[PDB]
């Protein structure tokens, strides 16, 4: 798995791969790793899929309950706080989870990283999975805050491609999302074999 | 440990040894392994003494409580079943062998052989303990239908003597009991009274 996310002037961008393995046998190659929690939030899958789906569904339900009760969209900080305080009651059982919560609240964009151990932290560039190490190198050398939209897309795509080239437990297709002040949008879903020729 | 019980026309006979070990050190050598449950119902203890004493006390309590309400003497199958339940529920007892002998007015002399676990069986003669293995064939060659009291007694004595000369965890005196309608007859064999063989 390789999932990355970063924020800049015109909001946040998320990217992920589409492979799943069971040992050394490729089960499927068309997985959805960018979860659509709500029309204003987004998630991410890494580790166990059942967990990273169940708990995020519960989170979405709680967000909707809050919106109904208080008549105001919830914030990213409180959402990540909820998600962290939910799985902390299952410390030392076998749960594996690594997640990114992204959004835009009254004080601007927001990106938080969460995991099953308990460390919840903000930031501006994040990447997790078995191929995060290869993607950090490409994301750093190329990152900038005063960037355009037509370029961050290519940046994330190239990072994911170069991560799949070396890592064996990651490959398949590349999914990319972009969040804005209004809501998020699905911009593209490419294939690695169709990108290899685009480059050399 | 060597326990044994045989069944004859009227009643039954029980026999046991008189040793208790704590490894290779004999902590007792005049022990008593024939525990009464009622007037004419007896149990033989094999295994850990703690569990056996506890279960026997509880069973005596239950029986005596349930023999004053009905105002009728109890049976042997009832006591055997109480033991079976109490030993199947807690299979961590390691109480292990109990052989149960007695006399009821409906049937006659009855013998039950509740082993490790919670199973129950009726047999014409039964044996138990570590030193029983060495006296199987002998018994299988000597049992015959139509025995009397003296014959059962001497047969039990001979079998026990033979088991005690070969096993290290059994020895001392030989305690015997004879049960029937008229009453209970207890006795012991020590020294020159014990049957001796050549070498």
């Amino acid at each position: 798995t390789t999932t990355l996310a970063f924020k800049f002037r015109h909001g946040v961008i998320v990217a992920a791969d589409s492979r799943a393995t069971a040992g050394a046998y490729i089960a499927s190659q068309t997985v959805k790793k960018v979860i659509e929690i709500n029309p204003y939030l987004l998630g991410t899958m890494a580790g166990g899929a059942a967990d990273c789906s169940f708990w995020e569904r519960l989170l979405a339900r709680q967000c909707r309950i809050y919106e109904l009760r208080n008549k105001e969209r919830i914030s990213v900080a409180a959402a990540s706080k909820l998600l962290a305080n939910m799985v902390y009651q299952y410390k030392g059982m076998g749960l594996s989870m690594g997640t990114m919560i992204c959004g835009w609240d009254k004080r601007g964009p927001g990106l938080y990283y969460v995991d099953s151990e308990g460390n919840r932290i903000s930031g501006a560039t994040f990447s997790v999975g078995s191929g995060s190490v290869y993607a950090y190198g490409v994301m750093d050398r190329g990152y900038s805050y005063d960037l355009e939209v037509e370029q961050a897309y290519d940046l994330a795509r190239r990072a994911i491609y170069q991560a799949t080239y070396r890592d064996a437990y990651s490959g398949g297709a590349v999914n990319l999302y972009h969040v804005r002040e209004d809501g998020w949008i699905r911009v593209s879903s490419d294939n690695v074999a169709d990108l290899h020729e685009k480059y050399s | 440990t060597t326990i044994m019980a045989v069944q004859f026309d009227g009643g039954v006979v029980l026999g046991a040894d008189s040793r208790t070990t704590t490894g290779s050190y004999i902590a007792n050598r005049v022990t008593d392994k024939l525990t009464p449950i009622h007037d004419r119902i007896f149990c033989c203890r094999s295994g850990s003494a703690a569990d056996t004493q506890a279960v026997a006390d509880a069973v005596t309590y239950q029986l005596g409580f349930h023999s004053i309400e009905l105002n009728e003497p109890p049976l042997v199958h009832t006591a055997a079943s109480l033991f079976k339940e109490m030993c199947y529920r807690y299979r961590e007892d390691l109480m292990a062998g109990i052989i149960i002998a007695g006399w009821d007015p409906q049937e006659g002399g009855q013998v039950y052989s509740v082993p490790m676990g919670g199973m129950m069986v009726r047999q014409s003669f039964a044996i138990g303990g570590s030193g029983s293995s060495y006296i199987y064939g002998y018994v299988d060659a000597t049992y015959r239908e139509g025995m009397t009291k003296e014959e059962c007694l001497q047969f039990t004595a001979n079998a026990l003597a033979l088991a005690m000369e070969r096993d290290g965890s059994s020895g001392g005196v030989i305690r015997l009991a004879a049960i029937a309608e008229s009453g209970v007859e207890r006795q012991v064999l020590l020294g020159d009274q014990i049957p001796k063989f050549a070498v």
Binding site: Y25, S28, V31, A49, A50, S53, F54, M93 | -
Partner: protein
């Protein structure tokens, strides 16, 4: 002690424009012996949905009983039958319920879409599902999945036409595939059962294989 067993029993499923297919072997094994040769692993829930399971047998049986007990509950409390997506979404939760003492079954569901199309759902013993077009879970997955992706997805084939699938073609393909995957696997053989879901209803077939 060990509270699990291995029985085998590969499963296969396929979806089409207006039909769905679910195929299974027919045999039960334990170690190096054979218990029986008549034990299908395909079951019918409603008039437009069937399901197959493989793995530990007791769990399969009790899970089928559970699903059948809950469909009636839904029908009673809502006055309407349950769809396919709903059954999948319920199965995810039923499975995740036992996350720390899981089942050991690899489920697959086939049926008709809401309107008229064909739908397939592949699951895992923990409850992670996703909609797919063709899946061959089970023991012989590695033998069939690499084949269904060429003759049905047309991978690594250049200058080839799409020529969408049909009914008889898919049936014959399934037959040939299972006849070939019996001379190499030892847990599979002695018969083959097919359940087909169409606009009309649910139909069944039967074929014979070699007896080891």
């Amino acid at each position: 002690f060990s509270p699990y067993v291995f029985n085998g029993g590969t499963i296969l499923a396929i979806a089409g424009e207006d039909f769905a297919i679910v195929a299974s072997d027919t045999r039960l094994s334990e170690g190096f012996s054979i218990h029986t040769r008549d034990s299908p692993k395909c079951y019918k829930l409603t008039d437009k949905t069937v399901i197959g399971c493989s793995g530990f047998h007791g769990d399969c049986l009790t899970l089928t009983k559970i699903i059948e007990a809950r469909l009636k509950m839904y029908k009673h409390s809502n006055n309407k039958a349950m769809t396919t997506g709903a059954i999948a979404a319920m199965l995810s939760t039923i499975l995740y319920s036992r996350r720390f003492f899981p089942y050991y079954v690899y489920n697959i569901i086939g049926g008709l879409d809401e309107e008229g199309k064909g739908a397939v759902y592949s699951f895992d013993p923990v409850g992670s599902y996703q909609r797919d077009s063709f899946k061959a879970g089970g023991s012989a997955s590695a033998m069939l999945q690499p084949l269904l992706d060429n003759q049905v997805g047309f991978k690594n084939m250049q200058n080839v036409e799409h020529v969408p699938l049909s009914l008889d073609r898919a049936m014959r393909l399934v037959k040939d595939v299972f006849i070939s995957a019996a001379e190499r696997d030892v847990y599979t053989g002695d018969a083959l059962r097919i359940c087909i879901v169409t606009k009309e209803g649910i139909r069944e077939e039967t074929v014979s294989l070699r007896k080891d």
